[PDB]
Design a protein around this ligand. Structure first.
Ligand code: NA
Length: 229
């Protein structure tokens, strides 16, 4: 029983740390303007929300309406901040191990293509990540949670999606992997925010929920893809 032929990776939260950096920008721009929120609230409610929606939330939940310069300053600073994206601890080692073992893998991200590659670059992962790196523009904009991106990634590796394992930190991305026919392993590295928690990923249908790249490599070894260490 060898369950998998290939690994399909999420980007944000699994290979690179971006949601925490974005949360810090919200927190500082707001704090400067009088409203002091904690990073967990910001990560939970602000990240991956449309700007008008953030304004509605601020008004409804905090009786707060930001000053005119709010949009401009946020943009100026999300831009400057994107350079500060880092690799998730252990991620480079997982990619290096898979490459040494000759296991096919691909990355599937809802990031716009330029940003996807910028993040891999500043995180120091470009060489390790390889060339099977897919954003929604490869599937006509039908990004996660549609299965299309992971179906396509599997196709590009010449492997059936049913024989892939998808490593994801959100319901949005986990759903895309399951809908493609893959097995879902949640990965929630602590110390970094993720869009959903372990209970949600398990209820969604993750076969497991791992909490470190060391645990991921151990699981991949149990599945016959790496050597147990
Ligand atoms: Na993610």
């Amino acid at each position: 029983d060898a369950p998998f032929d290939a690994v399909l990776f999420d980007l944000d939260g699994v290979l690179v740390e971006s949601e925490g950096i974005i949360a810090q920008v919200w927190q500082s721009v707001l704090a400067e303007r009088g409203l002091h929120l904690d990073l967990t609230e910001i990560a939970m409610y602000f990240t991956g929300q449309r700007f008008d929606g953030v304004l509605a939330y601020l008004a409804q939940q905090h009786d707060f309406v930001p000053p005119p310069d709010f949009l401009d300053v946020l943009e100026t600073r999300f831009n400057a901040a994107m350079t500060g994206v880092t690799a998730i601890e252990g991620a480079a080692e997982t990619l290096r191990a898979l490459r040494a073992a000759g296991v096919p893998f691909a990355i599937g991200s809802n990031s716009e293509r330029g940003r996807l590659h910028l993040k891999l670059r500043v995180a120091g992962l470009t060489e390790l990540a390889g060339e099977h790196i897919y954003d929604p523009s490869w599937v006509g904009g039908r990004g996660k949670p549609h299965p299309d991106l992971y179906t396509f990634a599997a196709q590009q590796l010449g492997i059936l999606p049913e024989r892939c394992v998808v490593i994801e930190d959100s319901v949005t991305g986990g759903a895309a992997g399951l809908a493609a026919g893959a097995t879902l392993w949640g990965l929630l590295v602590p110390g970094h925010p993720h869009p959903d928690g372990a209970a949600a990923l398990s209820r969604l249908g993750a076969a497991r929920v791992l909490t470190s790249h060391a645990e991921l490599r151990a699981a991949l070894a149990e599945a016959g893809l790496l050597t147990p260490a």
